[PDB]
Structures are given as C-alpha cells and as structure tokens.
Design an enzyme around this catalytic site. Structure first.
Site, PDB file in Angstrom:
ATOM      1  CE1 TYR A  38      -4.113   1.708  -0.037  1.00 11.07           C
ATOM      2  CE2 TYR A  38      -3.415   2.799   1.961  1.00 11.07           C
ATOM      3  CZ  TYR A  38      -4.294   2.677   0.916  1.00 11.07           C
ATOM      4  OH  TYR A  38      -5.367   3.521   0.826  1.00 11.07           O
ATOM      5  CE  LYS A  93     -18.505 -21.442 -16.741  1.00  7.40           C
ATOM      6  NZ  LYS A  93     -19.040 -22.496 -17.632  1.00  7.40           N
ATOM      7  CD  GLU A 135     -21.651 -20.147 -17.171  1.00 12.41           C
ATOM      8  OE1 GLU A 135     -20.790 -19.799 -18.008  1.00 12.41           O
ATOM      9  OE2 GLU A 135     -22.076 -21.334 -17.078  1.00 12.41           O
ATOM     10  CG  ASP A 136     -26.047 -20.022 -15.574  1.00 15.18           C
ATOM     11  OD1 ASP A 136     -25.695 -20.729 -16.551  1.00 15.18           O
ATOM     12  OD2 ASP A 136     -26.116 -20.470 -14.412  1.00 15.18           O
ATOM     13  CB  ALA A 194     -34.573 -22.873 -30.264  1.00 18.40           C
ATOM     14  CB  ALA A 196     -27.902 -19.945 -24.777  1.00 21.23           C
TER      15      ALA A 196
END
Ligand SMILES: CC(=O)SCCNC(=O)CCNC(=O)[C@H](O)C(C)(C)COP(=O)(O)OP(=O)(O)OC[C@H]1O[C@@H](n2cnc3c(N)ncnc32)[C@H](O)[C@@H]1OP(=O)(O)O
Ligand SMILES: CC(=O)SCCNC(=O)CCNC(=O)[C@H](O)C(C)(C)COP(=O)(O)OP(=O)(O)OC[C@H]1O[C@@H](n2cnc3c(N)ncnc32)[C@H](O)[C@@H]1OP(=O)(O)O
Lengths: 753, 751
Positions: A38, A93, A135-136, A194, A196
C-alpha cells in the site's frame, strides 16, 4: 429433502460461508510489507501504469483475472431464479477456472434484466478484468448482450453457455466424421432445441465445413422452417431451413447427425431407425439424455454416441473449452475471443483425442479428451494463443512455446490434479480391459463411512464392491442411510459362502505350524477380515479395504497372515502429501515400530518404486534428528540405511542421516551440506520409528493445508489396504481410488505370468 | 527511486499483482466438484431463490466488500485513471483482509460521469455484502455516495470522506477531555475543502460541537454564508456567519485547527494566537501543516496529531473502515449510518483511555496506534450494537462473547501472535524506564545473526552484545554493509573485566565434573561458555546461539553453566501459528527418549508458557496409538498424562492418542468421547526426539504456517539455541521471544 442436497448445503454453509476467499499472493505480515503493498510504496506501480497503461498487466492481477458475470436468468437447469440465487453457481464456475487453468475469478451477480442497463453497467468494468465470461443469461437477451459487449469492450467477452457445447461437440463431430468416412459438406445435421447453445452449434459446424441447407433446427413447436411465425425471433431465423420436413421425426429421416439440446426421451426408436448408416448421436440434455447409449446401440448397433453425462463415454463437458481458451487469451493479453480462436480450440481437442502403462484408444467410444486429462491445457491453451496472435488480437507475443508449457504445467500441480489423474488412470485401465472394474472387498459391510464412500465410488465406476456381513443387516443399514446406489452390490456372509471350506483348508495349510489347525482355521475364516484377505489371496477378489472401524493392528494382521509379504518385501505404510510444486511420500507410517537400517532401506526401495509408477524421480531422505553426524542411535541407523539403499539402487538419490527441513528444502542442503548427494530436495521421506512417521503424517493432514492420502500398505503380495480409523468419507473415497489402481496393476502382472 | 524500485519488483515478482482468488473448501476431486458446481450447487440456489436472505448463508456475500474506484482521486496522485488506480485498490483490499478478515473485490470503473457510474454500481448489489467507494474526486464523490446510499440496500461508504473525520473525531474527544473542554464551546477551524472536510464538521457536531463554532476554509479563504467565488452545493453545508475572512483571522482564539491542506499552512503567528492548550490536527500528506517539535516550539501547551507514523497520535483510516464494515456485515446491515460512525469514534476514544500492560493516556496517546491488535475486538461490536439499535441490522448478535470469540478467530495468531509479542516487549521496556534487554550473541561473526540484528536494534527490541575478536566482527559488519551495528558492544571474552571472576565461578560449579582451574579458564575463553556465564551472573539478560554450530554443542555449555530450575527439565518448545489457534510442540530438541515422568514435566512447562499468553492449555501425550496403553510408548504416554493430571488437576491432559485424534475435536468426540480432552489440544507432547524434531521441521517447511522456536524451557535463566537451519527472519522472531523471556525473568528475580 434428499441426502446429497443436504451434503451440498452443508458444504456451502460450514466454516466460512461460500466457496471463495481473496488472499494475498505477496507478504503482508509486517508493517514494511504493507508499506510496499500500500502507501507510500504502491504509488510506484500506479505512476507507471499512468504513464504506460499496458503495464496494468504487469503490476496487477488483471493478466489472470476473469469475471464470471450473470443476472441469473438462466441458471443451470433451474431457469430464471435471479442473480443472488445464482451466486453459488458463479462462485462454482470460478472454482472451475482456478482448478483447470489456474485462473482467478470474481463472480459478479448484476441486478439488471434490461439489456440496456446490464450492458451499461458491465461495459464500464473493463479496467478491472483480463476477460469476461458471461454465464447463465437467458435467450434471446444473451445473444444481444454478448454481441454488443464483444465489440464495445477491449477485453475478451465469452458467454460459455452459448459456445462451450458448440466447441466440444464440434471436436467430437470432426472425429466421428473421420471414423465413419464422412466429409462434412455432405453431412446432414439436425439440432433439437433452440436455447443459447443451438445457434452456436450451427455456426461452429458451418465454420468446420458443413453447409447450411444440410442443417435443420427444431424447437418446442417443431421444425424451424422459413416463413414460420409461431414462436420466432431474429436469432431463430439465423438458421431457419427451407426444408419440407415439419415434425422432429420428419427432419431426422435419413439423417447423419442428431444434436440434442432438449428433453429426456425426446429421441425415439422410430426416429433412430430412419437415420443414415453410422448415425452420430449427441444427446446433451440435462439431467437425463435424449436416449442412453445402451438404448441407442440396442436400436441401432452402428451408432456413435456422446452425452453430457460422465457415466457414459464421449462426455462433452464445457470444462474442456473455457479454461484453456481464456488461458490462451490472457497469456497473449488478447482483446477478444474470436472465431479463429474458438476453432483453434475445437481442432486442438479433436487432435488430442486422435493420438506410463495404458491410454484411451481412439474410436467410437473415445471421440474427445476426458475432462480429467491434464493434457488438454497443454495442447489447447497454446493453439488458442497462436490463433490470437495470428489473428492480431493478441497484444503480447509468446516466443518460447516449451517455456510456455512449463508455465502451464506449473498451473497444474499435484494438489490440483494428482487424484484427478489417478481416477483417470483407473478409467484407462478398466477401459483397456474390456471395461471390468476391480472387485474390491470391504469386510466392514455395515460401516457408515464405508457405505457412504461406496455411493460415490460405484457411481463413478472405480470398483465393484463386495461387502461382508449378514445380508439382512447390511441391506438394513443401507436403507436406513438411504443410499439407493447400492442395491445391486454383492453381500457375502463368510460362513455360508460356497468357497468357505476351501478357504479354511488353505489357511490351515498355510499356518498349521503357526498355531492354527482346522478348528481354529474355521473359526478365523468366519471373521470378515480373514475372509476378505483369503478372497484376495485366492483371486476371488482383486483387492480389499479395511480398518475403518477397528485399530490398525487388528485390521492389518489377518492381511499379513494370509497374503504375506512378497520376497524380501517388508510390510510398510505409505502416504502422499499433495503439495503445489511436488508431492511427498512418507513411509513407514503404520507397520514397523522401530525398523532396522536394513528394513528402512527396503522401505525406501518400495516407496521409490511407487513414486516411479507416477513418473517422478524418487529422491530419498532417511530422516533423523541429526544432520550427517552418524552418531550412536538413530543417526547411525539412518546413515547406514541410506548406504544400503544406495548399494541396492545405485541410480537413485538416497541420502541420510539428515533433519527433515534439510531433507525437503534444497537450499538448506546446498547452503549447509553441499557434499550431500541429495539435490533438488527429497520427495521420499523414510522415518526412523513409528512415532515420528505416524504423528508427522497425521499432523500434516490436520493442520497443514495440504491433502494427504493413505496410508497405503506396501510390501505385500496381493492388493490390500488398511484405512486409518480416523478417516473421513472423502478419505475412504480417495483411498479406494488408489486401491483400485494397485488392484488393477497386480491383476495385470498376474495375467502376464 | 530505490524504495520505488523495491515496490515495483514487489508488484512484478511471482504472480503479477497482490491478490489471487482461492477456494476455502475442497475442490480438486470429482466429489468436491460435484458439490461446488452441478449438481450439488443446485441445492443452495434453490434455497436462496426461496429465501433471498440465505444468499448470506451459502455464498461469500457476508464477508465480501467491493472496493470500487474510478481513479479520479488516487492517494496523492490525483486523477490518474481506473487502470492506474488498480494497484491501490488491490492494496486497500489487502488492508481489509488483514485488519478485519474481510474478502474484497477491487473494482476499477471507467466512468467519470456520476449517473453512469451510479448505474453500474447500483446493480452489482447482489454480489456484495458492502461497497467501499475509494479515491473518487470531489465534488462527484459527494453526489455518488449520497445517491448510492439511498439506492442500495447494502452499506455504502466512501472511506476518503469519513475516515479522518472518525479517527480525528476520537482524537478530539480525548484531547478535549484532557484539557477540560466541552464540545459545546470548542472553536474549530478546518482548513481545506477536500473530501474529508464536510464529514469532519458533521461528526464534530454529532459529538457536541455547535455549527456556529465551526469555520471552514479552502485555498481562497473562509467559507462564509453569501460567498460566491468558487462555491458549490456541498461547500455550503457549513458556511459560517463569521466576520473573519482570512485563515489567520479565523484561528484567532480558536481551540482546534483541522488541517486538511498543504505543508506550512500553520504559521507561528496564527499559532501564537490560538487559545490555551491548542489542538492541532496537521494531516496534510506527504508533509504536515506543521511538525510536532515546531508546533511545540511555538506553543509548548500544544497537542498535535499528524497523518504520519513518525510522530505520536497518527491519524490513519485503517483504524476506521475495518471494524466499521466488520460490524456492518456481521449484523447483515442495510447501511452504515451516522450512529455506527459515532459508535466507531467513541469506541476508539475509549480504547485509548484504558498484551500484558499498555500505553499511557495523555497528550501523546490520544488514540490507539494503527496496528493495535485490540481495535477490531473493541470497535466492531460497538458498531454492530449501534447497527442493531438504529434498525439497519437484519441479523441480531445475541452472544457478545461468542462474537468476540469470532473476531479473535478472524485475528488469530498467524496474523497477530508475533505482533503482540513485539508490542509486549516494547511495553515491558517502556514500563521499566526504557532499558532494553541485554542479549549476548556468542557468534558475533555470523552473517545470519548480524542481518537479523539489523532489524532487531532498528525496532528497539534489545541491546545486543556480540562476541569474537572485535577486529574480525567489525570487519564483517563493514563487509555486509549493516551500519546500525557500529555502536553495538563487542566483547572478546578473555579481555573482559569480569572474565576471571567468571572462570572461578565455572570452576566452583564443575570442579567435581571434570573441570579444574586451567580447564575452566580454557573453556571460559569459548564464546558459548562465556555467554552462558554472562547470562548466569547477570552481566547479560539473555543469550541466543546456535546459528553456526550443531544444537548439542551449543546447548551443552548453557546446561553445564546455567542449568535447570527445581524439578525442571531442559526442553525445546515450538509454536505453530495457525489461523484459529497456536499449537505448542515439545520437547523438540534435547531429550532423545523422555520417560513418562519427564514427559509430564515437559507438559507442565509448556502449559505455563501457554497460560502466559492467556490461553487455556489443553495437553495431549502423543503416540502411534489411541487409548490402548500397550507396552511401549503407548503405555508411557498414558502414564505421562496420568502424572501430569496428578500434578495439575485443574487442566485437560489426556493420552495416549494419535495426533489427528489430539488436535481434532470431532475425531475425538466421534471415537473417544470418554476422554477428558474437549475442544482440541493446543499442547502436544512427543514420545521421542525423532517424532518432535521431524514434526516441527516438516510442518515448518511444507505446512503453510509460520513456526517459531525452538525455545529452551526448564532452565534458570533466559537462553535459547537456534536451529542451525534457521533463516534470518527466523532469528528475528526467536530474538523477540528471547527478549520476552529475559524481561520476565528479570522481573521475577527482583522479587
Ligand atoms: C493408520 C494408523 O493410524 S496406524 C496405527 C499405528 N500402528 C499400529 O497400531 C500397528 C503397530 N505395529 C504392530 O502392531 C505389529 O508390528 C503388527 C501387528 C504389524 C505385527 O503383528 P504381530 O502381532 O506382532 O505378529 P503377527 O503374527 O500378527 O505378524 C503378522 C504376519 O506378518 C509377518 N510380519 C509382521 N510384521 C512383519 C514385518 N515388519 N516384517 C516382515 N514380516 C512381518 C509376520 O511374520 C506374520 O506372519 P507369520 O507369523 O506367518 O510369519
Ligand atoms: C533445533 C534442532 O535441530 S535440535 C537437533 C536434535 N537434538 C540434538 O541433537 C541434541 C541431542 N541431545 C543431546 O545430545 C543431549 O541430550 C544434550 C546435548 C542435551 C546433553 O547431552 P550431554 O553430552 O550428556 O551433556 P553433558 O554431559 O555435558 O551435561 C549436560 C548438563 O545438563 C544436565 N542435563 C542434561 N540433560 C538433562 C536432562 N534431560 N534433564 C535434566 N538435566 C539434564 C546434566 O546434569 C548436565 O549437567 P551436570 O554436568 O551438572 O551433570
């Protein structure tokens, strides 16, 4: 609700809540360290980056920091449940990134379902991250969001849910077409679903060479035909076909390839009959595939099959794609993940599948690499790097590729991959033997730890367990613990086993001059420990595991009395400590109270040969409280032990007497005892007495933060291991993995002679 | 540029940057991933969907703070950008982890516009338990903070605005208490209109100051009501109706000067005309408005605080946000309101007005030091209490003892054990008139020893005495370029005045143990023997040897000279500094094969040392066996435990047991609930030297825990022998604890 769910819940809630923690990679214990980390010291990198912006990659985590970003509108198979409720999967993930490519991840749950606000919020996060993993996110928003952010941002953007399946299955289809002598321009493909993933599948298949007119897309209303109005949008027209076929059954008639992105049972035998010869089936639906591989080959024997399930061959798993891809992207400091790179990944995987003891044979049941293959990173990440630079999107050239693979291997040390690799090897062994799993006996058939471990074990094809005890009582404990995966398992009561009396005859003949006559042999053979040992000895089993519920001596004794040591061998406990750069082997941790120099030497030889089984150079230290003194007592014993060992195995680094840190730490060795012939640190440690070994490995296991597996019984003629009774369930699971290995090895050797 | 270069390599080395995200749970194996990701991960998801609050139970949310910045006001570098501000944000994060055990994501945002910035941050809320805005220039930061505080239902706090307010606030309370002022009458003028000023005024008023008694100034002078030149919405908050227009005019008869400005701004004339007992907060960086020595030169009655560590009363933000957020998160609060900020102020002030012993409250100790290990335990619960009382908490803390326990778990020995030791050494010296412990180092020519001594004398840890030929030791000291040791006393044993009196003593001690006078003289010429005698006769307070010699040869002259106390046994003892606890290992160095009786006594010695650090010792006699008592060491350890329990019936002492059985309480309860050891052991006694020695060395190398020692216990005076494998940092630690042992013994001796 269920047992497994409850385990997961406790997994997330116990100790520190969640699955991630942010730690320092640099010293920060003293006031000075903080004066560097720092103010006023931290001003130095800032000043630098201000003057030369690219240097943010040099002084900060960016070059290895990926965002996993979601609004939680399409979480797994749970749908639109919200960002906060989606946080555990984003953390998860992150974990996959870390474990498979060593990539750091921040999980970001954004409370924005409006595309406009989502993109405005995310775009502006770019300085922070090296790359973005969307994601998702539900369709059709995910399409709009990814397309937009892919250019508006000057770092990679990649929605895994869209492209993972496309990439991996892309590789799988390349190889499947190669096997069946198809060329893709003529390959007729049908995609069912159909979501993603579908559009990316069609695009990637075309990039690999298939023609659009030969591809037909379907959803819930049937075939997606051109001119359709019912349930369409901009992105579903992207691959609408001008085919005459209208139902799913009609599209698949005379068809080559089925890409299933839908629901279980959707693919029917009638549909299967009307595919082309050598039909290629990708049943990627979750939790159950469109049809199981057995049903598919039952209907049509020439079929090639891939699932999202690990239970079956040719698993397409997204984990084969994004880690290596992002890896390659980050190491080249690339601005995007373009089609050239995705294609590079596709081909690298496909080529990898198309090329120690045994290895997976390329064919219809092996189309792509396995997820637990440590080579995918080594092969794929560099081709992605190459593609990024060749496309000019890389901003940092990689010149030395061998040095680059070194850098990738460092990311994949034993603490991440050793057990993963073991399990894989068990799988290569069984697969290379026509698929039979090693038969492993558990004399403690009612042990709660054991049954719970066996759940995990049977599900993942590590062995075929045989339990010992009264059948009614074990079926009862199994039902009380609600473990349904074990309704098929063989349960044997020793006295009523058909081969019981032949067993007692054998034990008798073995020990009739060691205090055991027929009466007593009968008595002992009624004991599961003895029965198990005898099954293993007599070949009615390939290996055995005991000691989960009794002290080691009592569990190990029948093993040593029945099976015995091989010639010149010595019964000896051995553990692995799985560190990041190395693993250490410790022996003897269980059997010999106070081994002689001669015995220590032999233990060393045994551990050495095991370490070699794993492709490592064993470097052996005979531990003492002393450094190269040879004093009366333990020093002389360990020095002599090293001398003897070296005489029987002159090719190995074997040294002693020395202290433990002297042994493991090579700088200490060079600084203080450079005359020693042990160089680079020892990875095999043999102890002078049972106190030192048993206590060391247990303490390391409890308070060190490194996995340790074992003890494993070495020195004996057939495969058997005695658990530490303090073991956990996950502990037994690891143990049985390595017992499966030992069993497979010994069976192989027996089948040679 | 050298400090600069050091910092650069610090950031560049190893892994780029200063942070990495790691798993807190197993996730390498098939099972572990089946729980961390699909299908197991569905279970927490399904739960949270059902009850959003459970996001706090199954994810890092409750301990995750975003340090968010756009780099428009980075430290003292100004508007340098988002990417260029990244290192200080990672750094800020490290401070969060170290001072509150809070996990942080550093977020550098590329948005200078208030509306888009706020739109980006607002929507990250599900991700974080709280947002720490950092280094955003004024006046934007004002608007941003007010806005996100309304818009977000998790705490929002821009530390740059409120830190100095809070810390200097505590400081002001105490300074007023010393000088008998009531806040109602105190006249304050704050100089500078940066991010810190408004919050200073606001907090001071909350503490009892009157708006009327406070004057704000910037570069152009007094901020009066009706001023037009360079004003804005926020500079208006504290516009004064004073007739004064210059700074010098405002400070005339003033009580308090809050300098948030530039070096030199406070001059002898304006300072001469402040009221009696002037309170000066000179917090400009890099240089204060005035140095403490000059301010006291002009006005002897002045009380002074700086933003610098060189001087007393350091105002540093690191005293603020860590406990503030800790309290905030642990009550799962929706905000950090004024009530909580005040809780922080008051607690800090009270803590300063109260290790073994501590500092003296007065004009030079108005607040805790930034590195006070008591701060989190003291402040975080008061913040939490205020959070609950003010209604912004959503999870009540019921058991305050359980909560302080939890904070101790967060600020465990791996972070603070050595820190507290150092503080304790300093306060021992301080409470005893400043004498440093005389520690003699017989290996005056050892490079490792000299290098450690650099740090040691620099940090006021001891008065080293080196032994060897004065020539050769100064020669090596010059060779290694360590200038701090040009003053250190160097003794050539045979040339010491008390030398011959020493030899007589050795003689009288060992005349029937193979040593007559000639031999005594001869031995006393050896630095090891000389050091030992020096400590024995009180010509030194302690000694540390063994950097360049094997342990036996080093420890023998100590044992022959100083010897054991009654019923004691010489025993090596080590600490393993883990995160929740420390483990004690003994005997790691001297006894090859201690008997049951010896193991018992070793246990007692370890116990007393652990009690010295305020821990309940729980002792396990280690074996390869669990409660079998078979012939051999199992029997020995079971008997050892029985004897120990007989000698100290108040303690949990148990055996025989295995090591995992010992340190792990679940194993114990699951398998051996009959045992009298509950809660895991913190003292581990070994059956033999192989086991102990190999254990501590192994743990030290491959474990990821600092291990300190061995320390020789059982002996009459303070002496320790290093492991010859020690690193330099090892020697500084060892010498810290040697200093403590030395101080303790000197104190008890004077009784
Ligand atoms: C995971 C953990 O926590 S481990 C716990 C710590 N370790 C322990 O508790 C076990 C300590 N060691 C022992 O108890 C003993 O050495 C034992 C049980 C291994 C040996 O058993 P004993 O009762 O002394 O003699 P026993 O007749 O049972 O010997 C077993 C058989 O193997 C042989 N055998 C046993 N030990 C050895 C050895 N070191 N080397 C070669 N052969 C051996 C014996 O010759 C015998 O076969 P035989 O009688 O037909 O010739
Ligand atoms: C940090 C590391 O790496 S440690 C390395 C591993 N540890 C070692 O190598 C040291 C091995 N241990 C030893 O060699 C011995 O135990 C030593 C060095 C401690 C002492 O051995 P000795 O050669 O017998 O010492 P010596 O004969 O000079 O006497 C030691 C003095 O202390 C006393 N003493 C020594 N050990 C003990 C003991 N366990 N209990 C009580 N008194 C003791 C003796 O009375 C003696 O005093 P005396 O002359 O009045 O009788």
């Amino acid at each position: 609700t269920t047992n497994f769910d409850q385990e997961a819940l406790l997994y997330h809630q116990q100790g520190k809540p969640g699955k991630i923690e942010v730690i320092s990679s640099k010293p920060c214990a003293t006031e000075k360290d903080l004066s560097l980390a720092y103010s006023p010291g931290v001003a130095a990198p800032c000043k630098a980056i201000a003057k030369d912006p690219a240097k943010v990659y040099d002084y900060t985590a960016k070059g290895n920091l990926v965002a996993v970003i979601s609004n939680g509108t399409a979480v797994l198979g749970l749908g639109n449940i919200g960002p906060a409720a989606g946080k555990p999967v984003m953390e998860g993930k992150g974990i996959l990134f870390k474990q498979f490519a060593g990539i750091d991840v921040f999980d970001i749950e954004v409370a924005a379902t409006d595309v406009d606000v989502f993109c405005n919020a995310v775009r502006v996060l770019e300085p922070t991250f090296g790359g973005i993993n969307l994601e998702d996110i539900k369709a059709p928003e995910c399409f709009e969001i990814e397309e937009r952010l892919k250019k508006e941002m000057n770092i990679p953007v990649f929605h895994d849910d869209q492209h993972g399946t496309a990439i991996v299955s892309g590789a799988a289809l390349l190889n499947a077409c190669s096997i069946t002598n198809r060329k893709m321009e003529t390959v007729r493909i049908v995609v069912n679903g159909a979501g993603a993933s579908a559009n990316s599948c069609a695009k990637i298949f075309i990039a690999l060479g298939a023609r659009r007119e030969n591809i037909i897309m379907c959803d819930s209303q049937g075939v997606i035909y051109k001119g359709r109005t019912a349930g369409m949008n901009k992105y579903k027209e992207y691959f609408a076909s001008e085919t005459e076929a209208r139902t799913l059954t009609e599209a698949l008639r005379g068809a080559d390839v089925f890409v299933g992105l839908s629901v279980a049972g959707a693919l029917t035998p009638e549909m299967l009959k009307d595919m082309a010869k050598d039909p290629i089936i990708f049943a990627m639906a979750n939790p159950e595939p469109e049809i199981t591989p057995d049903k598919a080959r039952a209907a049509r024997p020439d079929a090639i099959i891939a699932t999202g399930r690990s239970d079956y061959p040719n698993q397409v798993n997204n984990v084969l794609g994004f880690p290596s891809i992002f890896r390659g992207a980050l190491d080249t400091r690339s601005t995007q993940i373009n089609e050239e790179m995705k294609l590079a990944a596709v081909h690298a995987l496909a080529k990898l599948a198309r090329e120690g003891g045994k290895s997976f044979k390329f064919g219809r049941d092996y189309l792509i690499p396995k997820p637990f293959d440590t080579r995918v990173l080594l092969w794929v990440a560099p081709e992605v790097a190459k593609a990024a630079m060749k496309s000019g999107v890389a901003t940092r050239a990689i010149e030395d590729w061998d040095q680059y693979r070194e850098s990738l291997e460092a990311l994949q040390g034993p603490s991440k991959v050793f057990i993963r690799s073991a399990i894989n090897r068990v799988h290569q062994n069984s697969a290379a033997n026509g698929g039979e799993l090693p038969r492993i006996v558990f004399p403690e058939g009612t042990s709660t730890k054991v049954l719970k471990a066996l759940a995990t074990l049977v599900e993942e094809k590590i062995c075929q367990p045989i339990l010992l005890g009264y059948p009614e009582r074990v079926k009862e404990k199994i039902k009380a613990l609600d473990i349904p995966l074990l309704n098929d398992v063989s349960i044997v009561h020793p006295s009523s086993h058909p081969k019981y009396f032949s067993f007692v005859e054998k034990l008798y003949s073995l020990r009739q001059r060691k205090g055991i006559n027929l009466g007593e042999a009968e008595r002992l053979m009624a004991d599961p420990n003895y029965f198990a040992a005898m099954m293993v000895n007599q070949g009615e089993a390939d290996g055995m595991v005991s000691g989960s519920s009794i002290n080691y001596a009592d569990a190990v004794r029948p093993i040593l009395q029945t099976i015995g040591v091989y010639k010149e061998g010595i019964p000896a406990g051995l553990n692995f400590v799985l560190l990041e750069d190395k693993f250490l082997v410790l022996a003897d941790t269980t059997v010999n109270l106070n081994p002689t120099a001669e015995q220590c030497a032999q233990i060393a030889l045994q551990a050495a040969k095991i370490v070699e089984y794993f492709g490592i150079e064993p470097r052996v230290a005979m531990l003492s409280y002393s450094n190269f003194s040879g004093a009366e007592g333990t020093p002389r014993k360990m020095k002599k032990a090293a001398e003897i060992a070296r005489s029987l195995r002159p090719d190995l680094m074997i040294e002693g007497d020395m202290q433990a840190d002297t042994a493991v730490n090579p700088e200490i060795m060079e600084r203080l005892f450079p005359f020693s012939g042990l160089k680079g640190g020892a990875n095999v440690l043999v102890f002078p007495n049972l106190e030192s070994s048993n206590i060391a490995y247990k303490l390391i296991q409890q308070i060190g933060k490194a996995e340790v597996i074992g003890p494993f019984l070495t020195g004996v003629r057939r495969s058997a291991n005695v658990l530490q009774r303090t073991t956990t369930v996950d502990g037994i699971v690891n143990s049985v993995v390595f017992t499966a290995l030992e069993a497979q090895y010994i069976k192989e050797v027996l089948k040679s002679r």
